[PDB]
Structure 1
Amino acid sequence: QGWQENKSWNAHFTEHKSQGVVVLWNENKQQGFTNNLKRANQAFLPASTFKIPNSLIALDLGVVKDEHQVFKWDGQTRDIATWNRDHNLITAMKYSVVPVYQEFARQIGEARMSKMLHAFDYGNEDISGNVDSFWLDGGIRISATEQISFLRKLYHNKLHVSERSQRIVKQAMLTEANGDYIIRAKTGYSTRIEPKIGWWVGWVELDDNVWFFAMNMDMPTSDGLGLRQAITKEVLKQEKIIP
């Protein structure tokens, strides 16, 4: 089997009248768990979770000099208000500012974007579509288990980019931390192509172990976005990963 199936986590999806998959990886024991082995291997558009490889590539090619470089707002008012201001790599990740990352992809270019995604072993490695939207409405597809594989390489500094690039991106992935755990992660909301889904991918660092996770769920409207982190934390608590 490889992966173990734990159907009891479906209770957390059903409790919120939702459908989806959570995948966990225990790094110390090299064991994986999921509520749905089939959906765990189903490949979707990455949407904003593609900000992780896009950040790595932009840094390594010097499109982004460091996490303090300011990317000026282009003056075009967009629907998410946090986008209509200047950003650096830290705040553009936090607020998931698409137009900044679309400019990164334009500067990287089709040829180099394709070779890096092949170097990364990322999903189906297919960038067909527009250079600045293929991860939103083009041909790239990645499963939850494939996100884990990619994230594990990032955690260990094993992707073929500089160690510094990988350290900066993991810094920008910082989402939450207390005296018990650190979460580094990235959210995604795929809306341009059916089915609309939400993503949350990353890992939980403990004193003696790290737990990688990748989840996606059906997201017909934006009012459910909070359930990405809420369902994931319910699974993490049930498995006694976080208190």
Structure 2
Amino acid sequence: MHISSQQHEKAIKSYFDEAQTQGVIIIKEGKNLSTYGNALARANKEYVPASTFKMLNALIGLENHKATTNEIFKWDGKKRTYPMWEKDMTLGEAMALSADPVYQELARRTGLELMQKEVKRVNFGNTNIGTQVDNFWVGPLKITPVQEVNFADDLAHNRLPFKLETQEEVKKMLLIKEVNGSKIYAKSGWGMGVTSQVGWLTGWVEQANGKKIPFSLNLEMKEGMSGSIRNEITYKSLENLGII
């Protein structure tokens, strides 16, 4: 395929421009990282992981037998931020809905001490979870888009320090799209910040031939933006690059 890199860069930049945001999307092919978008310097800047952290939370909870993948976490009947969360769900259904209350229960079964240890051990982001287990994913923990794409790469290839089966079980929770033979695995994130909001979509493409291409989209979310913009820009970018 004969599109210039200049034209790729301009197309992907324009997807962020057209959404009235600032963002980057990092792509990893083998050992090589590529940075695209309209704010490239976001790539080695730190932001809260927000719900991208559900990936690690799940890994920790399963590895330490705080939950199983078929277990049903019951809605306790209290009003929840979103009505779609007002139902009983497995970790996998909760991942798909990004249901904080399930993931908070799981973090609390894991407990603050074991959670610090696991986060220090996996070297995730700046590895600081502080002293609130229920909610540290508002500071102190932060991570860069480069770190996130490298986390995705690890997970996709079963390199994190967890059992193979723990990693497969979590990967299975992350399937969000199939497109022309390709599978996209990823987790979204939307954090409320200092003065802005961060938007994430971190995962990988599994192509028919088996090659895995990790990515991490990171942009600033604004009032009146739908969450699915993160998806649209991701799919467009990966399509532009011929990854899907």
* Pair in the same fold by TM > 0.5: yes
Question: Does 2:226 match 1:224?
Answer: yes
Structure 1 unaligned blocks of 5 or more: none
Partner SS for 1:236? helix
Query: Are the counterparts in 1 of residues 176 and 185 from structure 2 also a CA contact under 8 Å?
Result: yes
Query: Are the counterparts in 2 of residues 184 and 202 from structure 1 also a CA contact under 8 Å?
Result: yes
Q: Distance in 2 between matches of 1:184 and 1:155?
A: 9
- Paired residue for 1:138? 139
Query: Are the counterparts in 2 of residues 129 and 138 from structure 1 also a CA contact under 8 Å?
Result: no
- Paired residue for 1:60? 63
Residues 142, 52 of structure 1: alpha-carbon distance in 2 compared, 3 angstrom cutoff:
same
Equivalent positions of 1:98-117 (< 5 A) are 98-117=100-119
- Paired residue for 2:23? 20
Q: Distance in 2 between matches of 1:222 and 1:59?
A: 36
Question: Does 2:95 match 1:96?
Answer: no
Equivalent positions of 1:110-129 (< 5 A) are 110-129=112-131
Query: Are the counterparts in 2 of residues 121 and 150 from structure 1 also a CA contact under 8 Å?
Result: no
**Letter in structure 1 aligned against 2:20:** K
Q: Distance in 2 between matches of 1:89 and 1:114?
A: 21
Query: Are the counterparts in 1 of residues 23 and 219 from structure 2 also a CA contact under 8 Å?
Result: yes
Runs of 4+ off more than 2 Å: 4-7
Query: Are the counterparts in 1 of residues 25 and 215 from structure 2 also a CA contact under 8 Å?
Result: yes
Partner SS for 2:225? helix
- Paired residue for 2:161? 160
Find the partner of 1:214 among 208, 216, 219. Answer: 216
- Paired residue for 2:84? 82
Q: Distance in 1 between matches of 2:224 and 2:132?
A: 25
RMSD across aligned positions (CA): 1.7
TM (norm. structure 1) is 0.91
Aligned residue pairs total: 235
Residues 222, 165 of structure 1: alpha-carbon distance in 2 compared, 3 angstrom cutoff:
farther
Equivalent positions of 1:163-202 (< 5 A) are 163-191=164-192, 193-202=194-203
- Tell me the CA shift for residue 175 of structure 1: 0.8
Query: Once the two structures are superposed, what CA deviation does each residue of 1:105-145 show, in whole Å capped at 9, x if it has no partner?
Result: 1111122111111221100000024211000x120001111
- Tell me the CA shift for residue 179 of structure 1: 4.3
Query: Are the counterparts in 2 of residues 126 and 139 from structure 1 also a CA contact under 8 Å?
Result: yes
Query: Are the counterparts in 2 of residues 190 and 198 from structure 1 also a CA contact under 8 Å?
Result: yes
- Tell me the CA shift for residue 7 of structure 1: 4.3
- Paired residue for 1:204? 205
Partner SS for 1:213? strand
Greater mean alpha carbon deviation, residues 34-43 or residues 167-176: 34-43
Residues 82, 193 of structure 1: alpha-carbon distance in 2 compared, 3 angstrom cutoff:
farther
Q: Provide the identity percentage.
A: 34
Q: Distance in 1 between matches of 2:179 and 2:109?
A: 37
Q: Distance in 2 between matches of 1:24 and 1:88?
A: 31
Partner SS for 1:223? coil
Q: Distance in 2 between matches of 1:106 and 1:126?
A: 17
**Letter in structure 2 aligned against 1:200:** L
- Tell me the CA shift for residue 79 of structure 1: 2.7
**Letter in structure 2 aligned against 1:102:** Q
Query: Once the two structures are superposed, what CA deviation does each residue of 1:88-111 show, in whole Å capped at 9, x if it has no partner?
Result: 011101111101111111111122
Partner SS for 1:115? helix
TM (norm. structure 2) is 0.91
- Tell me the CA shift for residue 224 of structure 1: 3.0
- Tell me the CA shift for residue 217 of structure 1: 1.1
